Design a protein around this ligand. Structure first.
Ligand SMILES: Nc1ncnc2c1ncn2[C@@H]1O[C@H](COP(=O)(O)OP(=O)(O)OP(=O)(O)O)[C@@H](O)[C@H]1O
Lengths: 240, 238, 86, 240, 239, 228, 204, 233, 250
């Protein structure tokens, strides 16, 4: 009774419900996972189709914050765009006062501090966004971090977000993160995404992909679907 | 029922009712249907008034030369954001000596409405803006919501019972990209004509249309300026 | 607003209504009074008329006590049922 | 006995008690960890562990041993989101000590300054008390090694051997008998006891890869994290 | 700073602390006053003095300048501030535009400042009102009144405090052209207005008249006792 | 369920604004008329007792030289807007050497329509009737406490405004002369007032491009009284 | 100059068991006399004084600020102010403005509130604390002050010889410069009583 | 500015009593016992610090934190709120020592500190301290002993006590401690009355004895602490 | 965050000030102080709250504070609560003496503090001051003056006083003992001791439980007489001799 109101207020169970409600808030969003190969980092986003709804390529959850880093977000899109501006401005501070590529670690840390700070005051609310962070470089290598609305900064070789999560990362153990090059990881991910997320709930959908690594020379960009057209080729034949 | 008090509080279901209650204000506004083709874009709005003697309140208003917009709901925050909207126009028009592509322009709007959707004591903004504009790749149509989500579309509609208009859209909006400005206009208002009751107009003064193009600057059409657009149309059947 | 007078039409059968009394004028002076308070309006008309021995209540006679009977009873409490559930 | 908003804010109960800090006390149990702090004559050992639910976990990113100073490490308990926020402020205050006073911080005063800020979190009712638990070590000139702890009551603490948290109540009473008697403490003595107190509480006896063992000794005073290879040497040394 | 909404609009359209503030004025001291062509007169009562305490400390009537005099009702604590406020504004109207101060200008300052004093955050409305009396330039009379909402308004006669309806009822026989056709009669007219006011014991009643530009003189309970004597003598000759 | 006084309704909209519209019902009624010759506007002073001084309360004050205005509900509530708007139009005249249009006053007040809040306090519930003569001739405008502007030919406010618009549109037409509109106002006024008609009960606010200002003067209304 | 504008000389000297302080009564702008009744030394507390030399504005201002904090000190703590605490109070007050300092030559001559023990000190215009065990001299011309007092003042002096000594010193020093004169006032204080005398000096 | 709410959380009860401050008095009673004695030459304070487990070392944390070289102090109640006003008073005496260049009077510390503390009770949105200070020192040859409270009032006692059973101890200090005795006796009856409510174990680490000589405050080492009381009292 | 404030500032719908009513109830308890009309002097007395003989009594005047050389005050309420106000008004007085170099008269002094107290009442939700303290002093114009401070922001200055609610019987006693222009301050002193000899619950009238601070007008020193209990005891026994003589009638 009223304990869940302010995030700064504790509960008789010794936690904060505002974080808790914020977590499943991101779970109701469409599935968005991530995985990293050895020479790069793969991103993926699944865009639902309700009515039409509008033009293809709109309000994609794949955002590019930095030269070598990008944002694959889930949950409420607005807060994700605002936090993408926050990471943009922080990265700009690093490039201003140092002049080289911001390491993934301290990047996601600087963001994580904000995620935690907006949960220590009754004025603002915990964020309803959970996003994937990954990058590759020659003096750095392949790192992937997972950030949650509570403000925990950590990372795995792969992670899953959205309504399909446990079932989305179940087949990840079958995939080889090391031996499999990124070129193959693309199709390996897209085929399961086409098989997961059953079409009874959502009749139509659309899938976005992004990648950064050595093949793009550290430049992070959405992989062009007219190029190689990898997904539908193998994903439409992978249903059997 | 007490957890809907603040904008900061997260519902046990994770749905903040303040934004939904603003969406109801969007539904209480007039039905306006915007649409664009591969070349020119046409936006249509509906004028309403309280008494017969009162002049119908206009919706579409001119901001940038190539950027017109519609409106619905609260006019207070609407004109506030409209001052902001003018600011952003003349800004790049001064510094860069060039206008701003709407794509990057509305991001600024969503970030503007992000703060009052989070900090305590602040309220969201009820908004019915439908923005149209031409960068080098042609027209763009977006949508505005108190949640601060803008969606790129070829056509969208808000207001009272504006979904029924969409039902006419889906089949028509795919084939309306090739057509020129002329028929595009009346195809715009054909969606509104099914939103209003079918036993009455749909006059010239209760409706607002504007046309904007890559080579055609945006001009507000109202009253007698709508007379060329309404003429030569077929009435709705029974 | 236009419906407030209907309560006055039902209560008009009681006592005696002078032909010059306007109900629509009195009705606007008491918004949000439902029917109970205006029942007490018609009531205090003849109530204060008995004390003044008047057989019929003249429109100007009771209204002087009607602005008082709405305000004086709103002074301690305005009866905010809208606030009870809000 | 409770009256008014005292459950939701930070004040005194009708009996003088505070509800928020007692909730934060059990806030550590939601992390499900254990930390044991043992100090010898010339040495001090810190032992902890980690949970690896998925094979995608990186040992490096999820390591719970934080290093504030080259010569002074630390560890935390409970949720990590709250601990991280305290990490950067620990380090910041270390650097400002080094800037203002020109010499390394005793670490004795570090927990005190930190605990003052923790008082502010305890005082203001419109901000979260930050219930993470701070555990530090240190090295003083001719004072031997030192072991400190800090709890979110806004106070400082530091003893010979102290262990606080979920299961630490039982590890304490186990340590009290091992310290004395008359038993002296050397390097291998402390290292070999770190696992005994963990086994008595747990008795899982698992792969050394999950547990992390920190140590601080005056040979090279620089703090050092132990490799799994040598940890396994001590683990087979204690089991004959 | 201090940000809080003190007064809000209720769904009935009436504010709360504003209209409720009028009850404090009904529960305050009673004060009266009149206007005339030459000598304007005020009044005050319900002092509740124990006759063992000095009257200047309980004094309810002050003046900004010799031309414009101040009279308030209700609780004095909130009036102190309004006084000093109006003193600064009267001294500014003196500073710039050196002409004497007009009641219409100064009371409008009190009302405006009290209005925003009911609007901004961290501001609790006053529960008191007041009425100002003087004599306009060129021998004209001047008076105005204040309101919790800050609505200035000029009366022909002052009826406020406990039993304002009762005194105002007596003013109906006061507005006759005969009263007051003479200053000598105006004074006794205040005593006759206070006779139906409060206890009308002839002790707490205090009044000062201002004739044209001449400053007012507070009268001791010497002439007021003779005026009471002639009041009971007028009721004697009326039988 | 009193939420920050700035928070939307479940239906919904702004609570305090919705409630502030009801305060117009308890205020005095005023009926303006727009004519091709001019703009005439009248109000009922609603005199409670003979203690009231006739010229003390004036519901109509002219904001700009050629632009008038009429308030609604509470008086001092509009005071703050009144005196500040006149300054607005004045400064317009200073920068551009030209007077402000009747339409300009609208957005002038709309920008300050709702400034209330806590950080960074109560919205005024006084409605405004804007009279004046712009470059297009005599114009009459109406605005509401929520800030929604609408151009009204003949608009009424206060209590009976619902009943007043009623008999209004019945007798209203676009061929109304100014002298006809004048005596058409008082017909409705005398039906909605309890006190007998006198020069102290109501006042007429008229303005014309060729007759000004005007404003209005005394004894002119006294001739209109006998015109009934 | 700045200090030669108004001028003035303040001289304080300690006797055997007592202490004396004296200052000239001339007040004028440059070479123009104004008034001779102007008061420079002001009484502070009991059995204690303060001398001031410089612009008369800073004299009065510093005197009033000093009385300000003084009373606040003696109202909180019933004990009288100590001589060391007084000198430190003045030092702080003058140091408050580093780049906007007042132009004055403070001279502090007063008895210890504890015992008959006297004390003397003078501070720099920027508030530099300075103490002496013989005398303190601040004014227009320091040559005749330091010149005469070393050949006159003795370690042990009764009030008779103290008065006459500081007398002829102020006479010979003041009569040399034209920006001082118009009589000199002498304040000699002891444990038993306070004595104030006015010297006979040239009025030209 | 936080947001700057700053609304006082302590209302006045119908009887005039304070809510949060009386509850803080409950926190003072629930604290630890600490006695003090003002007799003859100087003031002697006796605190009590007991470890909840045998793993604890009291050579690190000190309960007696002298603010000045000639001004010591102890406390009762919760420690966290004690450290706060410690650092406070440390910065607070320095303006006095900087302006006047003179050791600040014990009675001056109280007024300044309790004024900021009382404001800390009236300041909106924050709870008062739950610590009752016992302030001592020697100034002008006559030492002094003061006692503070969460509401901020200040008293002067020859021998006082705080903590549990302080009302029972107070009657002991009244009869058993009177007139004026040397610092040695001051230590004696202090330790006797502290051993009243203390456990059946008394070690150098169980308590500490602070002393204010007219030569200035000196904090005694646990060595002498166990030397006088061994053989307690 | 709006729900956490108790709304101490806003009124009570009954017409009363909610916080201020409870505020006055604090003055009803605790402190007790008196005042009386005296010629060529003024007198004040208070009842010590801690009558325990273990105190050091090194504070000299406790419940009687001296804000100025010509004026003093008698506090009733929480000590430190006043101690903010005493240094406050003390600085205001001292800045009058700084600006004009003239002793501040009692009028504007008191009213300045009263407006300070009023400020805390109309905004901020702050804790008002529940300390009602008295005022004495002498000015050139009006001479000896008696005033009293109220939490409500009004100054309660009269020629007599009731502090606290226990003294409301002293007011009824003062209406029977009312006098004009009679001093003999010792008569008013035996009167004020006659007040606590009856109205006060503590009997025997212990000279160590009360403190009498008189201020006699002296030019220009304005002598402030702080008396010791030794000469008060013989005065008390002189009063008890007057009591023993009054029972000799019947
Ligand atoms: N609009 C109306 N029409 C007719 N009668 C009315 C109206 N409003 C009120 N009344 C009369 O007023 C009387 C008092 O109403 P009453 O107090 O019974 O409502 P209620 O039962 O208390 O409402 P609720 O059950 O919601 O509390 C009723 O007997 C009813 O006849």
């Amino acid at each position: 009774t009223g304990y869940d109101l302010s995030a700064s207020t504790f509960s008789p169970d010794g936690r904060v419900f505002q974080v808790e409600y914020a977590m499943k808030a991101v779970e109701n969003s469409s599935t968005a996972i991530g995985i990293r190969c050895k020479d790069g980092v793969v991103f993926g986003v699944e865009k639902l189709v309700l009515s039409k709804l509008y033009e293809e390529g709109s309000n994609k959850r794949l955002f590019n914050v930095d030269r070598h880093v990008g944002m694959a977000v889930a949950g409420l899109l607005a807060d994700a765009r605002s936090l993408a501006d926050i990471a943009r401005e922080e990265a700009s501070n690093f490039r201003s006062n140092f002049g080289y590529n911001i390491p993934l670690k301290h990047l996601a840390d600087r963001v994580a501090m904000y995620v935690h700070a907006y949960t220590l005051y009754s004025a603002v609310r915990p964020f309803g966004c959970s996003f994937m962070l990954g990058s590759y470089s020659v003096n750095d290598g392949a790192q992937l971090y997972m950030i949650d609305p509570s403000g925990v900064s950590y990372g795995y070789w792969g992670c899953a977000i959205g309504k399909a999560r446990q079932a989305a990362k179940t087949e990840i153990e079958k995939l080889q993160m090391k031996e499999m090059t990124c070129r193959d990881i693309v199709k390996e991910v897209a085929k399961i995404i086409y098989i997961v997320h059953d079409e009874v709930k959502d009749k139509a959908f659309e899938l976005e992909l992004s990648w950064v690594g050595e093949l793009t020379n550290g430049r992070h960009e959405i992989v062009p679907k007219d190029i190689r057209e990898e997904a539908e080729k193998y994903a439409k034949e992978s249903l059997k | 029922n007490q957890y809907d008090n603040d904008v900061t509080v997260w519902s046990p279901q994770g749905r903040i009712h303040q934004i939904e209650y603003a969406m109801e204000a969007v539904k209480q506004g007039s039905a306006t249907v915007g649409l664009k083709s591969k070349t020119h874009a046409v936006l249509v709005a509906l004028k309403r008034a309280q008494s017969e003697l009162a002049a119908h309140q206009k919706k579409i208003l001119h901001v940038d030369n190539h950027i017109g917009i519609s409106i619905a709901g609260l006019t207070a925050d609407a004109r506030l954001l409209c001052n902001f909207m003018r600011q952003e126009c003349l800004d790049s028009r001064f510094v860069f000596d060039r206008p701003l592509p709407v794509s990057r322009l509305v991001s600024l709007i969503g970030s503007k409405t992000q703060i009052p959707t989070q900090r305590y004591g602040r309220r969201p903004y009820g908004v019915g803006l439908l923005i149209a504009g031409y960068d080098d790749m042609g027209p763009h149509i977006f949508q505005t919501c108190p949640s601060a989500n803008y969606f790129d579309c070829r056509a969208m509609s808000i207001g009272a019972r504006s979904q029924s208009a969409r039902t006419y859209l889906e089949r028509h909006m795919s084939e309306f990209m090739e057509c020129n400005l002329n028929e595009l206009v009346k195809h715009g208002l054909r969606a509104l004509r099914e939103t209003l009751p079918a036993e009455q107009d749909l006059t010239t003064k209760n409706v607002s249309i504007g046309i904007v193009g890559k080579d055609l600057e945006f001009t507000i059409y109202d009253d007698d300026d709508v007379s060329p657009f309404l003429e030569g149309l077929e009435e709705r059947p029974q | 607003l236009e419906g407030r007078t209907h309560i006055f039409k039902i209560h008009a059968r009681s006592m005696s209504v002078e032909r010059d009394i306007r109900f629509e004028l009195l009705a606007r002076l008491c918004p949000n009074s439902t029917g109970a308070e205006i029942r007490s309006v018609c009531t205090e008309a003849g109530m204060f008329a008995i004390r003044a021995r008047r057989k019929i209540a003249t429109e100007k006679d009771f209204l002087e006590a009607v602005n008082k009977v709405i305000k004086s009873y709103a002074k301690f409490s305005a009866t905010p049922r809208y606030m009870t559930y809000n | 006995s409770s009256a008014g908003f005292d459950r939701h804010i930070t004040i005194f109960s009708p009996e003088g008690r505070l509800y928020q800090v007692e909730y934060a006390f059990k806030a550590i149990n939601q992390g499900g960890l254990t930390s044991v702090a043992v100090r010898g004559k010339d040495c001090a050992v810190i032992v902890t562990q980690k949970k690896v639910p998925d094979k995608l976990l990186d040992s490096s990113t999820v390591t719970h041993l934080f290093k504030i100073t080259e010569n002074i490490g630390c560890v935390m308990t409970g949720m990590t989101a709250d601990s991280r926020s305290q990490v950067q402020r620990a380090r910041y205050e270390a650097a400002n000590w080094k800037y203002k006073y020109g010499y390394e911080i005793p670490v004795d005063m570090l927990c005190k300054r930190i605990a003052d800020i923790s008082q502010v979190y305890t005082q203001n009712a419109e901000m979260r008390p930050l219930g993470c638990c701070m555990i530090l070590i240190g090295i003083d000139e001719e004072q031997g090694p030192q072991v400190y702890k800090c709890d979110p009551a806004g106070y400082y603490c530091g003893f010979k051997a102290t262990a606080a948290g979920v299961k630490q109540t039982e590890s304490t009473s186990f340590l009290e008998k091992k310290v004395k008697k008359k038993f002296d403490w050397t390097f291998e003595q402390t290292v070999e006891t770190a696992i005994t107190c963990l086994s008595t509480v747990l008795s899982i006896d698992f792969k050394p890869s999950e547990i992390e063992v920190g140590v601080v000794t005056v040979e090279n005073p620089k703090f050092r994290i132990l490799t799994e290879a040598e940890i396994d040497a001590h683990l087979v040394a204690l089991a004959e | 700073s201090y940000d809080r909404a003190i007064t809000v609009f209720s769904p009935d359209g009436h504010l709360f602390q504003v209209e409720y503030a009028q009850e404090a004025v009904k529960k305050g001291s009673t004060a009266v006053g009149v206007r005339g062509r030459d000598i304007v007169v005020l009044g005050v009562e319900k002092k509740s003095v124990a006759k063992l305490q000095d009257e200047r400390t309980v004094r309810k009537i002050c003046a900004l300048d010799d031309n414009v005099c101040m009279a308030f009702a209700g609780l004095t604590a909130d009036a102190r501030i309004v006084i000093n406020r109006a003193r600064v504004e009267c001294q500014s109207h003196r500073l710039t535009v050196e002409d004497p101060v007009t009641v219409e200008y100064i009371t409008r300052y009190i009302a405006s400042l009290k209005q925003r004093y009911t609007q901004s955050n961290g501001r609790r409305p006053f529960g008191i009102s007041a009425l100002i009396v003087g004599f306009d330039f060129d021998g004209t009379p001047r008076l105005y009144q204040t309101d919790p909402s800050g609505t200035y308004h000029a009366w022909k006669a002052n009826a406020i405090g406990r039993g304002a309806k009762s005194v105002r009822e007596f003013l109906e026989k006061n507005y006759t052209d005969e009263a007051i056709e003479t200053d000598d009669l105006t004074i006794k007219l205040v005593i006759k207005a206070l006779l139906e006011v409060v206890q009308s014991g002839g002790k707490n009643i205090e009044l000062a008249v201002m004739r044209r530009d001449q400053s007012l003189k507070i009268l001791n309970p010497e002439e007021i006792e003779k005026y009471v004597a002639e009041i009971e003598k007028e009721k004697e000759e009326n039988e | 369920y009193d939420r920050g006084v700035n928070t939307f309704s479940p239906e919904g909209r702004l609570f305090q604004v919705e409630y502030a519209i009801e305060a117009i019902k308890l205020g005095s009624t005023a009926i303006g008329i727009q004519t091709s010759e001019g703009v005439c506007l009248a109000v009922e002073k609603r005199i409670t007792s003979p203690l009231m001084e006739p010229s003390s309360i004036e519901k109509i004050v002219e904001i700009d030289a050629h632009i008038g205005c009429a308030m609604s509900g509470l008086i001092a509530d509009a005071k703050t807007l009144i005196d500040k708007a006149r300054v607005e139009t004045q400064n317009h005249w200073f920068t551009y050497n030209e007077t402000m249009t009747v339409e300009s006053v609208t957005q002038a007040v709309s920008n300050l329509a709702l400034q209330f809040g806590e950080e960074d306090s109560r919205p005024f519930g006084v409605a405004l009737l804007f009279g004046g003569v712009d470059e297009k001739g005599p114009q009459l405008f109406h605005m509401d406490p929520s800030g929604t502007f609408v151009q009204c030919d003949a608009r009424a406010i206060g209590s009976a405004s619902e009943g007043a618009q009623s008999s209004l549109q019945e007798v209203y037409h676009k061929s109304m002369t100014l002298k006809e509109a004048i005596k058409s106002s008082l017909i409705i006024l005398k039906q909605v007032m309890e006190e007998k008609l006198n020069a102290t009960n109501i006042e007429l606010a008229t303005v014309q491009p060729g007759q000004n200002f005007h404003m209005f003067t005394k004894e002119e209304l006294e001739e209109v009284i006998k015109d009934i | 100059s700045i200090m030669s504008y108004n001028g003035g000389a303040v001289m304080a000297m300690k006797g055997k068991n007592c202490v004396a302080i004296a200052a000239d009564r001339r007040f004028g702008i440059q070479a123009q006399m104004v008034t001779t009744d102007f008061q420079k030394i002001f009484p502070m507390g009991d059995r204690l004084y303060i001398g001031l030399a410089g612009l008369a504005t800073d004299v009065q201002t510093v005197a009033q600020r000093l009385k300000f904090r003084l009373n606040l000190y003696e109202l909180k703590e019933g004990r009288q102010i100590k001589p060391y605490t007084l000198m430190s109070m003045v030092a702080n007050l003058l140091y408050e403005k580093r780049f906007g300092p007042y132009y004055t030559e403070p001279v502090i001559a007063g008895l210890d509130p504890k015992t008959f023990k006297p004390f003397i000190c003078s501070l720099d215009l920027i508030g530099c604390p300075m103490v002496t065990d013989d005398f303190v001299v601040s004014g227009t011309c320091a040559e005749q002050m330091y010149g005469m007092c070393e050949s006159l003042w003795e370690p042990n002096m009764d009030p008779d010889h103290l008065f006459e000594t500081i007398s002829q010193a102020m006479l010979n020093a003041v009569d040399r410069d034209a920006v001082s004169g118009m009589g000199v006032i002498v304040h000699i204080i002891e444990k038993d009583k306070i004595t104030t005398r006015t010297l006979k000096a040239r009025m030209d | 500015a936080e947001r700057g709410y700053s609304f006082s959380l302590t209302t006045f009860s119908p009887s005039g009593k304070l809510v949060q401050i009386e509850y803080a008095l409950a926190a003072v009673a629930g604290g630890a016992p600490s006695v003090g004695i003002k007799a003859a030459n100087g003031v002697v304070l006796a605190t009590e610090k007991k470890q909840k487990s045998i793993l604890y070392d009291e050579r690190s944390v000190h309960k007696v934190e002298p603010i000045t070289k000639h001004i010591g102090l102890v406390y009762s109640g919760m420690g966290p709120d004690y450290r706060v006003l410690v650092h406070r008073a440390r910065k607070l005496a320095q303006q006095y020592y900087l302006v006047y260049q003179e050791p600040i009077p014990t009675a001056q510390l109280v007024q300044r500190v309790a004024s900021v503390m009382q404001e800390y009770t009236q300041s909106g949105g924050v709870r008062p301290f739950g610590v009752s200070l016992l302030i001592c020192g020697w100034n002008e040859g006559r030492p002094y002993l003061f006692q503070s409270d969460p509401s901020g009032a200040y008293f002067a006692w020859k021998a006082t006590a705080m903590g549990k059973n302080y009302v029972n101890g107070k009657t002991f200090l009244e009869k058993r401690y009177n007139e004026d005795l040397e610092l040695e006796d001051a230590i004696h009856t202090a330790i006797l009355t502290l051993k009243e409510s203390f456990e059946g174990q008394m070690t150098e680490d169980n308590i500490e004895v602070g002393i204010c000589n007219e030569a200035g405050f000196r904090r005694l080492t646990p060595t002498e602490v166990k030397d006088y009381l061994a053989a307690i009292a | 965050s709006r729900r956490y404030d108790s709304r101490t500032t806003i009124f009570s719908p009954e017409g009363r000030l909610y916080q201020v009513e409870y505020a006055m109830e604090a003055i009803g308890h605790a402190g007790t102080c008196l005042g009386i009309l005296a010629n060529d002097g003024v007198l004040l007395a208070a009842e010590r709250r801690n009558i325990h003989k273990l105190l050091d009594e090194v504070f000299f005047s406790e419940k009687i504070y001296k804000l100025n050389e010509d004026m003093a005050c008698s506090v009733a309420g929480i000590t430190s609560d006043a101690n903010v106000l005493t240094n406050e008004l003390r600085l205001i007085a001292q800045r009058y003496l700084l600006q004009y170099q003239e002793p501040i008269p009692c009028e504007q002094l008191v009213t300045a503090l009263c407006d300070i107290k009023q400020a805390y009442t109309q905004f901020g939700g702050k804790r008002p001051f529940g300390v009602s303290l008295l005022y004495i002093g002498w000015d050139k114009h009006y001479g000896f003056q008696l005033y009293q401070s109220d939490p409500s922001g009004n100054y309660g200055g009269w020629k007599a006083t009731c502090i606290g609610n226990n003294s409301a019987a002293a007011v009824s006693m003062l209406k029977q003992d009312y006098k004009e222009g009679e001093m003999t301050l010792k008569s008013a002193l035996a009167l004020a001791i006659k007040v606590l000899n009856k109205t006060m619950d503590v009997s025997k009238l212990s000279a160590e439980k009360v403190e009498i601070a008189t201020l006699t007008r002296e030019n220009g020193k304005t002598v402030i007489r702080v008396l010791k209990q030794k000469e008060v005891e013989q005065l008390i026994k002189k009063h008890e001799e007057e009591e023993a003589k009054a029972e000799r009638e019947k």
